Amino acid sequence: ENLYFQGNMKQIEDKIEEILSKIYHIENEIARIKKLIGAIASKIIKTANYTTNALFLLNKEESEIRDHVVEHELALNYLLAHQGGLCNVVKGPMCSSDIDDFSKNVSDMIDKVHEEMKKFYHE
Amino acid sequence: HENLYFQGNMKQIEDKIEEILSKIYHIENEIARIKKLIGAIASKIIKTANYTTNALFLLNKEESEIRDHVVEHELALNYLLAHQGGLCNVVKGPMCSSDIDDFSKNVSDMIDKVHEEMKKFYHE
Amino acid sequence: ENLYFQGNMKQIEDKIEEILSKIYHIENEIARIKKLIGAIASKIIKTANYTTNALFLLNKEESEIRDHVVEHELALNYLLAHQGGLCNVVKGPMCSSDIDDFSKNVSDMIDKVHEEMKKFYHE
């Protein structure tokens, strides 16, 4: 009986309808995945922005603090001139040891974060 | 003649439906691994933001305390050097008298904002 | 009749060319999603590295400044001893207050970021 050609065509049609619904599920999930990835990108940018602003202000203040401390060291050595300066009065294996100024290096890091986030606006 | 022409084409259709089904299987597997991989990235963002903001909080608090003491020191040094025109006149420079910015509340504000962004990962 | 079976067979095959097309569209999209994800991972790593390099420097210099400020307090207390020390001459509820040293605590947070990022090289 050609009733076979009816039924096997039916199963094929049935199976196509399953395939299309599974493609439907996949498609909607891809739209969901793309959305979440953009939301994640957005959070990375916003977070990097806040963090680098915090870094900027810590760094500006650190350097101003350092200037004043180095000035204070000069003036305290002056007042301790006859005692051999702080180097002799307060004496430590790292007493005279100079104070690093990493403000430009930290600035350079801030610039590198800013440069990375510029790249989001193309990716 | 025709009985086999129906058959072979029905076989070609069926077998192509098996290719599609397996192709779908592999797509589903990649989709699952993608969602997992996104999940782990989100996780690392939160943990790294958490660690970084903790460091910022501590640098900030200490920087403020240090500032407080440098302020006292300048005062004491201005007092001690008073009969020489204060600190200002003795250890000169175009920026000797310069006030020291206090950015502690502005940094704290930046910490707040990161914490707020991370809160939002718990809603998606 | 023949024309019916054949005409439906055509409709099947037409759906198949439509399915295979949508699938290839999906596959191309999955590959643009994978590339996007890896670019994002790399931005996270670079960004974290620059930020922690900035934290490391700020921390190092903050710790040096602190050692110097502490010395200076001893020096100013020695100088103003014939007048009650710093606790009397500027007199505040946080004048003699000990300055916290969080350099190990900050180094710990830097370690923790480096460990989180080392993990990207496994996924």
Side-chain angles (χ1 to χ4, degrees), chain A residues 32-67:
Chain A
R32 285 187 187 91
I33 284 168
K34 275 146 65 181
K35 182 143 192 179
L36 175 54
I37 292 168
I40 286 172
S42 174
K43 291 260 166 53
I44 285 151
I45 295 151
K46 277 157 127 305
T47 308
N49 196 61
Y50 305 135
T51 310
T52 50
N53 287 346
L55 287 183
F56 171 87
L57 295 164
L58 292 168
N59 188 55
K60 184 176 181 11
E61 180 167 346
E62 195 172 61
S63 170
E64 299 164 0
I65 288 175
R66 181 186 179 282
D67 291 347

Side-chain angles (χ1 to χ4, degrees), chain A residues 6 16 30 34 37 62 69 73 76 83 86 95 97-100 102 105 109 116-117 119 123, chain C residues 5 12 29 36 40 43 46-47 50 53-54 57-58 60-62 64 68 71-72 75 78-79:
Chain A
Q6 318 269 347
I16 274 154
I30 286 164
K34 275 146 65 181
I37 292 168
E62 195 172 61
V69 179
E73 195 142 307
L76 281 163
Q83 289 93 354
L86 287 162
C95 179
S97 286
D98 273 24
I99 304 165
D100 299 338
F102 306 126
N105 314 88
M109 290 307 93
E116 284 293 313
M117 300 299 95
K119 294 168 184 174
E123 293 319 280
Chain C
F5 286 123
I12 310 279
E29 185 61 54
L36 258 166
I40 291 172
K43 290 260 167 53
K46 295 195 69 197
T47 293
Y50 302 135
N53 288 349
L57 294 178
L58 287 166
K60 182 170 171 71
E61 178 178 338
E62 187 179 78
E64 305 180 7
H68 280 274
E71 290 181 303
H72 292 190
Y78 161 72
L79 280 166

